[PDB]
Amino acid sequence: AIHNRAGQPAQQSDLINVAQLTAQYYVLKPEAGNAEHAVKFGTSGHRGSAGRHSFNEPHILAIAQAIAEERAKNGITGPCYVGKDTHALSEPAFISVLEVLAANGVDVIVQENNGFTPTPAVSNAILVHNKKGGPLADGIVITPSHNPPEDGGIKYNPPNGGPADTNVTKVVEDRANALLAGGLQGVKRISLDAAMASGHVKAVDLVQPFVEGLADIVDMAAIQKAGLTLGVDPLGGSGIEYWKRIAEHYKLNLTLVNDQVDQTFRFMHLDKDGAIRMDCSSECAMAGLLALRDKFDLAFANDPDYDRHGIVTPAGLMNPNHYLAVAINYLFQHRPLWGKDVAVGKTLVSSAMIDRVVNDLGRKLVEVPVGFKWFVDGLFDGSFGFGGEESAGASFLRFDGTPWSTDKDGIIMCLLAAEITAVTGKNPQEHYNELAARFGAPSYNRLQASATSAQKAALSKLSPEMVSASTLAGDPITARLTAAPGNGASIGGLKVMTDNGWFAARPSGTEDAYKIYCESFLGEEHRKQIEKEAVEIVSEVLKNA
Amino acid sequence: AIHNRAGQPAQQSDLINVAQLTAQYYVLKPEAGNAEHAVKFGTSGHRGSAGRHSFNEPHILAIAQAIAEERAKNGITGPCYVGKDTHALSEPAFISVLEVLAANGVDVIVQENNGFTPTPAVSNAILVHNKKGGPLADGIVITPSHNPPEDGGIKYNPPNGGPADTNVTKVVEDRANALLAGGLQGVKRISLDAAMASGHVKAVDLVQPFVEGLADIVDMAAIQKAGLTLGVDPLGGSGIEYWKRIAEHYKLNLTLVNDQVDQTFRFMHLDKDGAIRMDCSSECAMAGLLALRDKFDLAFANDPDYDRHGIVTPAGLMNPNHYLAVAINYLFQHRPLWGKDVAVGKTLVSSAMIDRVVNDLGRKLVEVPVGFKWFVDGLFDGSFGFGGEESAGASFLRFDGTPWSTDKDGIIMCLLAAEITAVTGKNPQEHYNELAARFGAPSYNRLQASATSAQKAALSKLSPEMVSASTLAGDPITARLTAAPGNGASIGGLKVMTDNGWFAARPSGTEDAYKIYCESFLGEEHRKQIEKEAVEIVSEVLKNA
Ligand SMILES: [Mg+2]
Ligand SMILES: [Mg+2]
Ligand SMILES: [Mg+2]
């Protein structure tokens, strides 16, 4: 908690003017040659704000044109599923996308009645469509994730249902930027009315198919039989109607603690920095649900795109690493159709509790670099049963070991917590407590140290033998890694291990620093000794550039 | 109350999508030759909704250009005060006005920090400016009054500070529609950024000078001295900050029962028809404040443009007619500096309680046709001390007999109630109860039925002697009128009166219908006999076409 009003309900003075911001999307423009206003279309698409000239009509027209061209180049002739979240700027962006796709003769499928669509609902729709074997579908999700009310975002999901990799995003980014530099000479656009009249835009209900299909991934019948008292704070996000339909279709005792949809997100409690941020894993942002935690056996929440999850019990808000370990431990014991050819994905900055759990089950661990992108292909072909990130986003397979969503899915992760509690009689936090009793309770932290550009660059291109330390916090170093053990890919940095702890260091993308992730199975004080030594080691390896 | 959720809190299903609506302002276009989409610029300016193609960018660009040209033609070279209310569509309209006015070399004055301004605050600003005697100022108010959240509006107030009359409005209307038919070719415009950098737009604080000036129209010291417990529901309207500053500046025990500014107006209770309508004189809409009526000596509310007032006492919400009679009876006995010649303005269809009051005061009554416009010139020149309409809107003079606002002013009418209560020790409902004990409690009703365009046309063009009856509801007819007795202007219909009651019939200005207003001082059964005989009379005179 950094801001004096962290954890308190937002005040009127904290709120955006929604109408003014939306107007700014049309009346303000990116400054030509100003890099800060340019399309930066990356792992999570392009994000910005109309009032900062970074999320305006020109950007989205440009991006939508770029996506139409690329998808056609790539032989993608089926429909494009275009979903949006409950951010203000998703409305104007949505319209720009329809105007341009329709003008390019792209068939678009949208949620009827201008509704909202979670990121995994777009992923799921693409996968289900493409399993029918005809022209390929892909998708666009119009969301800046949990970013404050004034922000907008837009991202692309190719036919494998997952987020677009750099081979797609870089091309799209450059084309969008050249289109901007050309004054939107090369953009095909028709009016909203013409687009709707064209026949290219089809409105369907994406909710029912997703909600009904949940029985093929989570044990919905077990949940029903347990008759748990469940709560959810939809956090004004894109899956609010999804939670309603889940409770209704499956006849669950599941209560929405509020049903607000408000583009100022005024019902929110302020995050640690005082921003309105819909972070389902932040205790400050989750203060509203946390105050009701005694009312439910189990409760949860999702960020605006519904790709992440927050799990509440009467003990509080679970730490995301803790829940990942529990999800994995449970899933691989309760999925008979996930045979020996189905492994566990883990990013290398995630808790080593995962390693202990997976070793204990006699399953294969695939350690990958930072980022969900490394799980997409394995989820898609069924070789990864589960892949998650320590920031509270994950996905796992259907019962039969085929994919449900190749993007992150917050709904299945919440429902899985319910299946766990229902099947085992123990909530996921009680599960973690037992793991911690068995393996020790690790202490985990993230920090950062000042670094010059030159240092940051050098950190990315090390090799294991540049690290001459033989010991870390009183234990022999068992590994010096510059590549991920699971897929061999570069980590763009360094990880040092002992039996009792580890650290990893990577250059900060945004600041003159490098980030340090570390963890100890012996506790806080030992973790603190790792931190100290981690800086010493990293200072040593890069003081010569 | 007709709708089954009348008076209930608004639900999420009742609300608009603010950003989608604002997008529609820029992406939806009026249809060429569709009269429902045309500019209709009248007594309240032009109102519509972006989603109905009746309040979109082309309309506002066209209207702003028409106003720029008309003010120049009319000799106005000073600044234009442009104020906006809290409707969503006020934001894009505001921007379009600045783009075009600055392109036309108009000097614009706005409330700083994108703040909101009551209609009477624009009127007052015009008056104060022009009283200095240099180049004339005029103004634009961006408001659809109490219309639902999806509506927008824009109206013009010339240098006398009141609403523009048809000599200006019809020219602006014809011109705007000409501009729309010519694809906006004669509209001059620059970007918002260019407008802000041009030096043509100045941002000031309009609140402080209005709030400080109140001491010159209402007896603030008397109110301060009484120490009453005052409540206000600003109803999410343009004067919310005005109530705050009045409380602070005058050190009043004045509580805002809600401080919400929300472009969905979600905090509202539903109106009698189940709509979200910010009608300060409607019991259903005021259900929230009415539930707290027992906490305050006096409480009040205003509509979004803050030109109307609703007065609450522990007895409930006052009938607007009833409050006018009290306001008049009080003011004309407590304004010693007003000349003996200063008159009372009264519309045609207001209560004859006003007549009884004004007679008793030995003051001049000026009965005018429907509409506040008939009071502007007399308020401006100080010959009308007070002008009010039955729909809960009025204005009156400063202590020294010079105008404060020549448009309707909800703030002074609310503060006057507190003055009345402070000075006399009785609230305004108590005073009305006394008026009723003295003269009788009148019974008032309005009727409506369908009529053809031809029957409607006839009704507006009668000659008094065409009424051949001698009696109305058992009393002799004392007057048969087709023109207002006060100013001689045509009423566009018929008024018949006796000593005990009256009726007036008038064609609807919007529907194929006529309305009949009637009132009896004998009670309900007498009023019902007036209703029956008025229908008979109207039927007979409309016996052709
Ligand atoms: Mg997210
Ligand atoms: Mg009004
Ligand atoms: Mg005039």
Q: What domain range is B213 assigned to?
A: 11-217
How many Cβ atoms from other residues are within 10 Å of residue B34's Cβ? Answer: 10
Tell me the C-alpha distance between A118 and A413, whole Å. Answer: 14
User: Do A161 and A208 have their domain in common?
Assistant: yes
Same domain, A49 and A138: yes
| Domain assignment present for B5 | no
Among the candidates A162, A189, A217, a domain finishes at A217
Contact B420, B379 (CB under 8 A): no
Token output for B80: 């234009």
C-alpha B60 to ligand 2 mean position (Å)? 20
CA-based R_g, chain A, Å: 23
Rounded Cα distance between A148 and A112, Å, is 26
CATH number of the domain enclosing A126: 3.40.120.10
Question: How many whole angstroms separate alpha carbon A126 and alpha carbon A139?
Answer: 7
User: Structural domain tally of chain B?
Assistant: 4
Same domain, B172 and B232: no
Please indicate, yes or no, whether residues A326 and A306 belong to a single structural domain of this protein: no
Give me the residues near ligand 2 (ion), CB cutoff below 5 Å. B 145, 303, 305, 307-308
Tokens coding A495: 């990880």
| Buried b / exposed e along B358-389 (16+ C-beta atoms within 10 A) | beeeebbbbbbbbebbbbbebbbebbbbbbbb
Residues B277 and B347 in one domain: no
Statement to judge: residues A364 and A490 lie in one domain = no
CA distance A517 to A68: 39
Q: How far apart are CA A104 and CA A194, in angstroms?
A: 12
B170 occurs within a structural domain: yes
- Cα-flanking dihedrals φ and ψ of residue B496, to 5°? -120, 135
Where is the domain boundary, A441, A469, A484?
A441
- Ordered DSSP codes for B136-191: --EEEEE--TT--TT-EEEEEE-TTSSPPPHHHHHHHHHHHHHHHHTTTTT-----
**Residue A2 domain flag:** no
Does residue B470 lie within any of the structural domains?
yes
- Which residues of B fall within a CB distance of 8 Å from A191? 27, 29
For residue B235, what are the CA distances in angstroms to A164, A323, A401, B7, B268? 47, 45, 55, 15, 8
Q: Is A145 a catalytic residue?
A: yes
Inter-chain CB proximity A19 and B260 less than 8 Å: no
3-state secondary structure of B70: helix
Task: Give the integer Cα–Cα distance in Å for A17 and A93.
Answer: 17
CA distance B239 to B411: 8
The answer on A171 and A271 residing in a single domain is: no
- Rounded Cα gap, residues A130 and A83, in angstroms: 17
What residues of chain A lie within 8 A of the CB of B12, using their CB?
259-261
Are residues A275 and A288 part of one domain? yes
Same domain, A437 and A473: no
Chain A partners within 8 Å of B263 (Cβ): 17-19
Quick one: B385 and B288 in the same domain? no
A255 contacts A230 by C-beta, under 8 angstroms = yes
Can you read off the two tokens belonging to residue A468? 């001459």
Q: CB-based burial of residue A454 (10 Å sphere; 0-12 exposed, 13-18 middle, 19+ buried)?
A: exposed
The answer to the question of residue A341 being in a domain is yes
Q: Is A5 a domain residue? A: no
Instruction: Specify if B103 maps to a domain.
Output: yes
3-state secondary structure B294-353: HHCCEEEEECCCCCEEEEEECCEECCHHHHHHHHHHHHCCCCCCCCCCCEEEEECCCCCH
End-of-domain residue from the set B253, B283, B316: B316
**Cβ–Cβ of A91/B20 closer than 8 Å?**
yes
Distance between start and end Cα atoms, chain B: 36
Nearest alpha-carbon partner for A498 in A516, A522, A514: A522
Q: Whole-angstrom distance between the N-terminal and C-terminal Cα of chain A?
A: 37
* Encoded tokens for A424: 């085992």
Judgement on whether residues B434 and B486 belong to the same structural domain of the protein: no
* Residue A192 contacts B, CB cutoff 8 Å: yes
Query: Partners of A501 in the beta sheet?
Result: A520
Q: Is A77 helix (H, G, I), strand (E, B) or coil?
A: coil
Cβ of A19 within 8 Å of Cβ of B92? The answer is: yes
Which region, left, alpha or beta, applies to residue B133 given φ > 0 means left and ψ of -120 to 50 means alpha?
left
Neighbouring C-beta atoms of residue A36, cutoff 10 Å: 11
A19 and B88 within 8 Å at the Cβ level: the answer is yes
The CA distance from B103 to B96, in Å, is: 11
Report the amino acid identity of residue B306: Y
Region for residue B470 given its phi and psi (left: phi exceeds 0; alpha: psi -120 to 50; beta: otherwise): alpha
Question: Please, how many CA atoms are within 13 Å of residue B310, restricted to the half-sphere of its CB?
Answer: 27
Residue A4 resides in a domain: no
Q: Do B27 and A263 make contact, defined as CB atoms within 8 angstroms?
A: no
Q: Rounded to an integer, what distance in angstroms lies between the CA atom of residue B155 and that of residue B162?
A: 11
Which of B54, B96, B145, B405 is catalytic? The answer is B145
> Chain A neighbours among B 9-48 (CB < 8 Å)?
12, 15, 17-29
Same domain, A500 and A449: yes
The secondary structure element, H or E, covering residue B483 is strand B479-483
- Nearest by CB to A23, from B17, B91, B259: name it: B91
